[PDB]
Ligand binder design. Structure first.
Ligand SMILES: Nc1nc2c(ncn2[C@@H]2O[C@H](COP(=O)(O)OP(=O)(O)OP(=O)(O)O)[C@@H](O)[C@H]2O)c(=O)[nH]1
Ligand SMILES: Nc1nc2c(ncn2[C@@H]2O[C@H](COP(=O)(O)OP(=O)(O)OP(=O)(O)O)[C@@H](O)[C@H]2O)c(=O)[nH]1
Lengths: 438, 78, 98, 49, 270, 427
């Protein structure tokens, strides 16, 4: 049937993995114990949770996700949390050693003796599954342990399972903020390894996420509780079609086909329009028109790219809530009449609509608004090549003065693989330029 | 009163009845008959209990038109 | 710690469903299907067959025979038949009951 | 189960929604117009007296 | 940008359209035609609280109105979703057909609910087989044939518990076992026999009066099976969720019948 | 006797057939459960053209539902009339479509055509003698286009002596949602042209205009749009089931509309569409329908034939009419626009009168049109095809499935041949 398996690598992906599952248990009303009230939804494990949880004859909802980590601090502490009884113990893949921000350590030193264990989980997750459309991979480009460890496993799961989708979600490196100077090393290393195997990589940047917080949400001092909630809301919206129906139902398989124009480049951008404070929701109104302007307002994107410096290829709007096609089709028609939005002449139509009736609900102790009409805007534009153009001119400087190489060559690596990534990258911009040229 | 009460006065104010009449002094049994005359039927037990509470809330102890109607709504809400 | 602080659960947060049902109600208009396209006055039965009327039923009984004489706009023989019979059991032959 | 669940609530709600607004507004208007007018006149006329 | 009182021309036209329908749906339902009026009246009849017979001798007599209950038993090995408490049998009508007609489905389903309060849905009148000239008020005897009837809130028509040898067309919905139904027809399939709790003492207790409020085992005369209720199998019906009730004999390791077919005859409390 | 078996294809056809069948059922007075309430004899007589008889007075529809995604027919089954549809007729797949034309045409179709062919031939043996078949789907409807093109191909050699009625909706010209939609349409239409005999052309945008024009309710439901097309589809079928001096056979009609084999694409037309005042402000007369019947605004199928001219016109009139008003009207209309027809064929009108009105309105009609207004349709899809095929965008999927651009070569060339054919016949 309609199910998938979620993957969360590194401590960077664990607390977002917690938050998403924390969010998920709300709309289904999952008690932290693992069971409903005396009302009956338990059985052979088949209801709205069957696509997400495994609430078998034992009656306990088992999330179909894997948390893999290499440092026991956070994973053991969350194992002392509140929903830990829901979580499977050795599914909470813990580790005793770190990768020291190094891709190779997580890819070579320790990943060998750990991937066999997690593959045992995946196959034993696979056998009970029925359709398993694909996977949900949550990671980070600047992965202290997320980067290297994910890269090997995605190689391993691609080779044995090359007939199903693999969905990638990672925080894009901050273009001007660098919490690590080895971060560019592993980040481009991950990209060149993943371009030929990753199906759909979705990125986001936290700086603009904060920028939203004190612009319209009016929060000058948020936390991960909010940040994880926003992205957890984002993945919830895309998975609402899996949970609920609508006027038309859409799936990740359609998303892949209708979003990626050509091979290699599979990196669109996501944006959520109704981002507003509860009071700013209270004394104003939400409708398709203004939110369409908002989601198409250049400053509402979480990635630092000016759409007027690029051009648009694909756009997907996922209207979750109470909407009618009449105003939507008229509103998007007005958008097509807009001159500033520059689609490429190659695509006359580039709009993928997914209508879902279900209103996006609030979360207890949350900061979101009371939304009746919401949309997730997935788009791909040429204004992103600057990010890799930003990456390389940092990288080329450091490479010539070959900083920190003694660390990497000391642990057994060499210059060739580093050399490979740049023309792999240099291929990307020229392809981006060539596709940019009509 | 303010121009708001002059430009938008209650129905009382068009024809010459005002707040001093509300706050003025009158007697127990007379208003009970008047309350029947104004079309509200009452019981004796309700009369005295209302009378007890009204004197308490007034902080002095008396009968005023506002006091009588206000405690009615209090009981009506109660 | 704030990590445990946001883990503090709370009851009475009931994930309802009613917004489903209103939104669903808006995407079909269930009773409207016989209400969108109904025309003129409601009528439970109106049907009858032309052969039955002209041949079997011998046409409209309550009609006045000489309902045709000098009229208004067309000051001549007119008001005879544009209405046509509609009444009486149309679908009541013996083979149905058997 | 979902089908049978679907039926009543759709029929149910429309019933109560229709009838409740039918009564609520109907009465809510009437006694207010009644009570405010009837009380004022009878109380205020004797105030003159 | 509109809606409350704008009285705009299209808003003018729209508000009418539904309104005559609101009148139209009004008069249709003002005739006592509303579905939930049907449901409430049927529920009103079904949920009518009854008055049970009170046994003065401690025994049971024909014509008595009793509630049949499977008592709560402390079983520590039924792993799964087991339902605690005393379970009383209750007729389970079909939800869809109950909406279409005020008359109960000619055959009716059976169920057991965690309810002890006397009511039309769980009150059963014990009756003779008809073939035996047993008078009303006569004590019931072990090994005798008889019928379990329920007046399901309907004046003049009487429902009798039924069961037949399981076929491929007639079986329990969940377990695929011999189903139990309620029919107004009087057949030999309506013959039932209460058995003493101890199988090793049934022959000793044959021909004896049956005491009030005690553990017994009931058997279908025509099929010779004990009435079974599944405290782990949930059925969804018109009032919510209850437990499956079938006719099958479950024996323990010692060939002794399980807690499942142990049934309580519940008489009125004086 | 002569009967029809229906096929429900594509995910639109799922909402199409659900609305279309209930339109038939309530018209024939059967309760949602299925126990017919005997009130009308002629519908009780002529129910065997579409419905067969189960036990206890239940009229089993002779339709087959096919899809891939469980949720759709589950919603259809959970509809008010799902109980009148058969789980036997619920054939489907265990795969998500991807809404790829080739997968449903080569990959997913392979393992499902066997079962569906068994179902239809069992249904074919269930009934005696068919006029033919009709299909509800979309030309731009990915899973429907993939299955339909396969099934219409196979049923051709199966029964090349029947009626291959087709009912497909044209996607919105301004936006197709699906970006590979013009590929799917071009793929489908290349198979449609040679395999079909009848085709209804329907577009959603014109329906939205009708919503704005006469419906005037701002926000309809897609089911209301389903209700409109089903009413039009019902009207043409009223000929067969109902008596009255009108020759009902589509073959009667088909030879009357079709001068040349390539003419398969036809546009519908419907009769009184009524607004708020006009349910009680309309003097219902045969004249006043006609200008509304012959209203470019009333036209709903593709576009205005004002840009072109009229090849064949055929309208079926439902209600208590007579031979003369349609006659003098037919005289009136040809007088109004004599040159707008073709000197090729005079007297290009084919009229039928159904004496049995519908339930709710008395004097109604339906129209089917074959005018020279389809050029805008496939000329539009032509530039779209040339645009993407210029740089073969979104092509790697079909090659991964096993398709090539070299197949696309004749599909447009066949389509280009149709461009001249419609042009040359008229211009
Ligand atoms: N995804 C995610 N990133 C965070 C969070 N908080 C801070 N970050 C940023 O995400 C990055 C985490 O990447 P890494 O340090 O490589 O994580 P890792 O590979 O799992 O291994 P560690 O070095 O032990 O953290 C840090 O550089 C932070 O700047 C969070 O909650 N989630
Ligand atoms: N059922 C339905 N279909 C719609 C609606 N609006 C537009 N459509 C179109 O009708 C077409 C026909 O559906 P199908 O033939 O079943 O399409 P499919 O093969 O499942 O795959 P897609 O065409 O890509 O959706 C779809 O492609 C939709 O684009 C609607 O409101 N309901």
């Amino acid at each position: 049937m309609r199910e998938c398996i979620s993957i969360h690598v590194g401590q960077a992906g664990v607390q977002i993995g917690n938050a998403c599952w924390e969010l998920y248990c709300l709309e289904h009303g999952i008690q932290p114990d693992g069971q409903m009230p005396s009302d009956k939804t338990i059985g052979g494990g088949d209801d709205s949770f069957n696509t997400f949880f495994s609430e078998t004859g034992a009656g306990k909802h088992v999330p179909r996700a894997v948390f893999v980590d290499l440092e026991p601090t956070v994973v053991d502490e969350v194992r002392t949390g509140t929903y830990r009884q829901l979580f499977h113990p050795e599914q909470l893949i813990t580790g005793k050693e770190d990768a020291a921000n190094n891709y190779a350590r997580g890819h070579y030193t320790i990943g060998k003796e750990i991937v066999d264990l997690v593959l045992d989980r995946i196959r034993k997750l696979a056998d009970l599954c029925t359709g398993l459309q694909g996977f949900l991979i949550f990671h980070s480009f600047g992965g202290g342990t997320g980067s290297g460890f994910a890269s090997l496993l995605m190689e391993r799961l691609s080779v044995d399972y090359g007939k199903k989708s693999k969905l990638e979600f990672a925080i894009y490196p901050a273009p001007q903020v660098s919490t690590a100077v080895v971060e560019p090393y592993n980040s481009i290393l991950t990209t060149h390894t993943t371009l030929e195997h990753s199906d759909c990589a979705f990125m986001v940047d936290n700086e603009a996420i904060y920028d939203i917080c004190r612009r319209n949400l009016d929060i000058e001092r948020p936390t991960y509780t909010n940040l994880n909630r926003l992205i957890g809301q984002i993945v919830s919206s895309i998975t609402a079609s899996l949970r609920f129906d609508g006027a038309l139902n859409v799936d990740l398989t359609e998303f892949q086909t209708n979003l990626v124009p050509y091979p290699r480049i599979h990196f669109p951008l996501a944006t959520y329009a109704p981002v507003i404070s509860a009071e700013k929701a209270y004394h104003e109104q939400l409708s398709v028109a203004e939110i369409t302007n908002a989601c198409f307002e250049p400053a509402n994107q979480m990635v630092k790219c000016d759409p007027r410096h690029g051009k648009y290829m694909a756009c997907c709007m996922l209207y979750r809530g109470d909407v009618v096609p009449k105003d939507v089709n008229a509103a998007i028609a007005t958008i097509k009449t807009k001159r500033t939005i520059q689609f490429v002449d190659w695509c006359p139509t580039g709009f993928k609509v997914g209508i879902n009736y279900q209103p996006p609900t609030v979360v207890p102790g949350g900061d979101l608004a009371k939304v009746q009409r919401a949309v997730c805007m997935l788009s791909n534009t040429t204004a992103i090549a600057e990010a890799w153009a930003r990456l390389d001119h940092k990288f080329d400087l450091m490479y010539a003065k070959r900083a920190f190489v003694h660390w990497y060559v000391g642990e057994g690596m060499e210059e060739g693989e580093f050399s490979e990534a740049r023309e792999d990258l240099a291929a990307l911009e020229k392809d981006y330029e060539e596709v940019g040229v009509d | 009163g303010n121009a708001y009460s002059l430009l938008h006065p209650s129905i009382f104010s068009q024809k010459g009845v005002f707040e001093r009449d509300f706050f003025k002094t009158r007697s127990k049994e007379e208003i009970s008959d008047i309350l029947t005359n104004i079309g509200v039927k009452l019981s004796k037990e309700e009369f005295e209990n209302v009378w007890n509470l009204a004197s308490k809330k007034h902080q002095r102890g008396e009968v005023c038109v506002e006091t009588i109607r206000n405690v009615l709504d209090e009981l009506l809400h109660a | 710690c704030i990590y445990r602080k946001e883990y503090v659960p709370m009851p009475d947060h009931r994930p309802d469903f009613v917004s489903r049902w209103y939104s669903k109600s808006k995407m079909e208009g269930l009773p409207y299907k016989h209400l969108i396209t109904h025309h003129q006055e409601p009528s439970h039965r109106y049907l009858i067959s032309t052969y039955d009327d002209h041949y079997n039923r011998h046409n409209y009984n309550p009609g006045l025979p000489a309902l045709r004489t000098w009229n208004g706009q067309k000051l001549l023989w007119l008001p005879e038949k544009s209405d046509f019979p509609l009444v009486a059991p149309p679908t009541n032959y013996g083979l149905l009951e058997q | 189960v979902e089908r049978q669940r679907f039926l009543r609530v759709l029929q149910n709600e429309q019933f109560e929604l229709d009838m409740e607004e039918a009564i609520q507004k109907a009465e809510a208007n009437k006694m207010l117009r009644d009570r405010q007018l009837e009380q004022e006149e009878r109380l205020a006329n004797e105030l003159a007296r | 940008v509109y809606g409350p009182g704008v009285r705009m021309g299209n808003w003018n036209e729209d508000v009418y359209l539904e309104e005559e329908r609101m009148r139209h749906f009004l008069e249709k339902r003002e005739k006592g035609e509303l579905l939930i009026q049907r449901n409430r009246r049927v529920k009103k009849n079904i949920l009518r609280p009854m008055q049970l017979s009170v046994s003065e001798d401690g025994y049971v007599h024909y014509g008595d109105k009793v509630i049949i209950v499977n008592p709560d038993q402390v079983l520590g090995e039924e792993a799964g979703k087991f339902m605690r408490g005393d379970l009383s049998l209750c007729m389970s009508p079909d939800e869809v057909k109950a909406q279409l007609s005020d008359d109960l489905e000619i055959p009716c389903g059976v169920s057991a609910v965690q309810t002890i309060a006397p009511m039309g849905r769980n009150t059963f009148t014990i009756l003779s087989d008809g073939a035996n000239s047993c008078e009303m008020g006569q004590v019931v005897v072990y090994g005798q044939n008889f019928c379990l009837g329920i007046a399901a809130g309907l004046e003049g028509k009487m429902l009798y518990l039924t069961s037949d040898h399981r076929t491929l067309l007639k079986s329990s919905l969940k377990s695929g076992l011999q189903e139990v139904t309620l029919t107004d027809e009087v057949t030999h399939l309506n013959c039932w026999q209460a058995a003493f709790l101890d199988p090793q003492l049934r022959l000793e207790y044959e021909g004896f009066p049956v005491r009030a409020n005690e553990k017994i085992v009931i058997y279908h005369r025509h099929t010779n099976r004990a009435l079974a209720v599944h405290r782990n199998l949930f059925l969804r019906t018109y009032f919510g969720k209850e437990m499956e009730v079938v006719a099958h004999t479950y024996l323990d390791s010692h060939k002794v019948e399980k807690p499942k077919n142990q049934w309580m005859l519940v008489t009125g409390n004086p | 006797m002569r009967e029809i078996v229906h096929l429900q294809a594509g995910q639109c056809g799922n909402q199409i057939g659900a609305k279309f069948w209930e339109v038939i059922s309530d018209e024939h007075g059967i309760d949602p459960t299925g126990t017919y309430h005997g009130d009308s004899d002629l519908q009780l007589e002529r129910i065997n053209v579409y419905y067969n008889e189960a036990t206890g007075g239940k009229y089993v529809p002779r339709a087959v539902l096919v899809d891939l995604e469980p949720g759709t027919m589950d919603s259809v089954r959970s509809g008010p009339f799902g109980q009148i549809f058969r789980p036997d007729n619920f054939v489907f797949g265990q795969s998500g479509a991807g809404n790829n034309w080739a997968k449903g045409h080569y990959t997913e179709g392979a393992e499902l055509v066997d079962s569906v062919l068994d179902v239809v031939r069992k249904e074919a043996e269930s009934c005696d003698c068919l006029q033919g078949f009709q299909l509800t789907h979309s030309l731009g409807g990915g899973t429907g286009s993939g299955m339909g093109t396969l099934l219409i191909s196979k049923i051709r050699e199966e029964y090349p002596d029947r009626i291959m009625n087709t009912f497909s909706v044209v996607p919105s010209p301004k936006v197709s949602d699906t970006v590979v939609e013009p590929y799917n349409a071009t793929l489908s239409v290349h198979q449609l042209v040679e395999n079909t005999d009848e085709t209804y052309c329907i577009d959603n945008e014109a329906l939205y205009d009708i919503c704005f024009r006469t419906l005037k309710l701002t926000t309809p439901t897609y089911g209301d749009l389903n209700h409109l097309v089903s009413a039009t589809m019902s009207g043409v079928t009223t000929c067969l089931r109902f008596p009255g001096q009108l020759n009902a056979d589509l073959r009667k009609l088909a030879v009357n509309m079709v001068p040349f084999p390539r003419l398969h694409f036809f546009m519908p037309g419907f009769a009184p569409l009524t607004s708020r005042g006009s349910q009680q402000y309309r003097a219902l007369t045969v004249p006043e329908l006609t200008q509304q019947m012959f209203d470019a605004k009333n036209m709903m199928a593709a576009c205005d034939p004002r840009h072109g001219r009229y090849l064949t016109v055929a309208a079926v009139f439902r209600g208590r009419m007579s031979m003369k008003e349609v006659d003098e009207q037919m005289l009136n209309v040809q007088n109004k626009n004599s040159s707008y027809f073709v000197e090729w064929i005079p007297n290009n009108v084919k009229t039928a009168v159904c004496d049995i009105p519908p339930r709710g309105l008395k004097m109604s009609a339906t129209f089917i049109g074959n005018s020279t207004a389809i050029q805008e349709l496939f000329k539009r899809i032509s530039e779209q095809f040339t645009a993407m095929f210029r740089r073969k965008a979104f092509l790697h999927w079909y090659t991964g499935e096993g398709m090539d651009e070299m197949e696309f070569t004749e599909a447009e060339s066949n389509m280009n041949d149709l461009v001249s054919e419609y042009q040359q016949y008229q211009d």
